Amino acid sequence: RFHSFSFYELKNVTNNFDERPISVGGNKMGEGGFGVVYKGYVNNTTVAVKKLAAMVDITTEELKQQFDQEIKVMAKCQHENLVELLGFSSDGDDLCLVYVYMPNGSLLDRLSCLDGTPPLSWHMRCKIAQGAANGINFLHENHHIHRDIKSANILLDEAFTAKISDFGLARASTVMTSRIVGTTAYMAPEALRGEITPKSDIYSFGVVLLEIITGLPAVDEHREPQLLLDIKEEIEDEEKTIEDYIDKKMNDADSTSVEAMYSVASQCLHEKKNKRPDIKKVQQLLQEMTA
Numbered sequence: 399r400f401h402s403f404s405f406y407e408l409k410n411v412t413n414n415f416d417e418r419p420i421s422v423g424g425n426k427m428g429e430g431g432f433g434v435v436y437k438g439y440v441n442n443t444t445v446a447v448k449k450l451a452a453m454v455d456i457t458t459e460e461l462k463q464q465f466d467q468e469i470k471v472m473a474k475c476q477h478e479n480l481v482e483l484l485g486f487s488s489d490g491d492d493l494c495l496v497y498v499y500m501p502n503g504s505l506l507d508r509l510s511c512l513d514g515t516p517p518l519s520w521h522m523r524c525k526i527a528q529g530a531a532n533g534i535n536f537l538h539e540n541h542h543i544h545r546d547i548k549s550a551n552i553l554l555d556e557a558f559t560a561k562i563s564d565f566g567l568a569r570a571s572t573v574m575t576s577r578i579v580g581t582t583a584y585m586a587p588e589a590l591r592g593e594i595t596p597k598s599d600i601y602s603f604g605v606v607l608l609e610i611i612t613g614l615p616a617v618d619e620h621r622e623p624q625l626l627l628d629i630k631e632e633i634e635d636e637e638k639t640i641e642d643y644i645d646k647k648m649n650d651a652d653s654t655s656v657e658a659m660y661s662v663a664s665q666c667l668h669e670k671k672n673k674r675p676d677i678k679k680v681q682q683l684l685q686e687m688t689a
């Protein structure tokens with residue numbers, strides 16, 4: 399069970415969902431999929447308040463289902479590598495999800511050094527990869543398919559502990575769906591065709607591992623290749639090496655563990671869902687990767 403907040407409480411803790419960035423004293427931290435996330439203090443606990451809004455091609459019912467799912471998942475799924483729902487507001491205006499704040503925000507934001515945060519060390523990236531995989535493993539152990547494993551949804555605590563976030567699109571447990579959801583640039587071919595399988599999360603995690611290795615977002619429209627997972631094809635076709643795409647904003651990246659992680663990334667990014675490692679193998683390979 400979580401604390402049921404009034405929308406006003408969350409309005410109050412988020413300084414009336416202050417749209418100004420946290421970086422300039424405001425409360426807006428990120429415009430996540432299907433909602434804006436606001437820094438807040440409930441008592442002395444820094445919280446992430448995800449205010450859910452219609453945004454892009456979301457119905458109220460689907461948004462409420464994703465809220466209900468987030469809470470449903472977050473109820474079942476407490477793990478050091480899953481974000482922690484403290485509670486929610488359904489009372490007024492927008493639906494709100496209150497989480498234990500993640501001081502280091504998204505892996506995406508940290509990989510991009512958004513707001514001038516220092517580049518993640520390879521060491522921290524390995525921990526993040528490991529943690530994220532431990533998060534995904536826990537979700538899969540608990541027969542939850544995240545269905546939107548992406549750097550944006552891997553949040554980073556005070557310790558850069560990977561916290562898998564956003565279980566709105568999470569699914570219990572292969573089955574198919576008419577409502578194909580997830581982030582294109584992270585989605586397995588089968589996820590993009592509406593297959594719902596944990597194997598898709600592995601693929602999406604593979605893209606994350608490429609993001610971690612490369613510091614490149616899964617998609618950059620102003621980049622060639624636009625899709626990071628293409629660099630896997632460029633590396634497999636020996637057009638490029640992993641060291642060509644390896645994030646230059648690291649000094650502590652050793653070829654062995656980066657190749658080890660790329661090897662996990664590659665295996666995760668097997669276009670054949672069944673030839674991908676299950677998250678347990680991904681875990682083992684990411685543990686093996688740090689000696």
Ligand SMILES: CC(C)(O)c1cc2nn(-c3ccc(CO)cc3)cc2cc1NC(=O)c1cccc(C(F)(F)F)n1
Binds near residue numbers: 445503515550
């Ligand atoms: C992910 C998000 C919203 O983009 C986010 C961005 C952040 N940026 N910074 C930040 C950036 C730069 C500096 C300068 O060093 C300091 C802090 C902290 C952040 C924290 C965030 N999320 C959470 O705290 C959080 C926790 C659980 C569930 C959720 C969710 F709503 F996503 F489900 N969010």
